[PDB]
Design a protein around this ligand. Structure first.
Ligand SMILES: [Cl-]
Ligand SMILES: [Cl-]
Length: 162
């Protein structure tokens, strides 16, 4: 188990434009194309990203290509953020993957609202952090996923995913 497999489980793979759980245009393995309601806008973002005239459908290799880029951008976003980096540096490999997961899904911004939990994490107060993390719209909207992530942080093992 690694970050790639873990995210591929949480997000799934779709080769045709689809609406995420917030209703946004997405494709592949969790790649958000646009928060806009326009499907054309989406198709356009799509073409821009793939580098071709897709007509809303991509191949598996293209999806994987988006996915690598996206995971990479997530880490770097972490490394770049002054409040996150130190939290992330303080943790073990598994727990880092759990933070990447959250940044992938919600963006640096989204993840930046978990200030309190993150302090707890820094101090390695696992169970408390887990409960704090659960008092969130995040958990209330995508509970099974949130749960897997949370356990992961609580436990430091890949059990929730095996
Ligand atoms: Cl892109
Ligand atoms: Cl879920």
């Amino acid at each position: 188990m690694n970050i790639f497999e873990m995210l591929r489980i949480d997000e799934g793979l779709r080769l045709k434009i689809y609406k995420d759980t917030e209703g946004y245009y997405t494709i592949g393995i969790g790649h958000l194309l646009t928060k806009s309601p326009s499907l054309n806008a989406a198709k356009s973002e799509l073409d821009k990203a793939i580098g071709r005239n897709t007509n809303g459908v991509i191949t598996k290799d293209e999806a994987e290509k988006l996915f690598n880029q996206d995971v990479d951008a997530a880490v770097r976003g972490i490394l770049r953020n002054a409040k996150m980096k130190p939290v992330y540096d303080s943790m073990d490999a598994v727990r880092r993957a759990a933070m990447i997961n959250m940044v992938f899904q919600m963006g640096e911004t989204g993840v930046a609202g978990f200030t309190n939990s993150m302090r707890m994490m820094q101090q390695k107060r696992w169970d408390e952090a887990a409960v704090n993390l659960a008092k969130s719209r995040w958990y209330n909207q995508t509970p099974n996923r949130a749960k897997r992530v949370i356990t992961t942080f609580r436990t430091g093992t890949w059990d929730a995913y095996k």
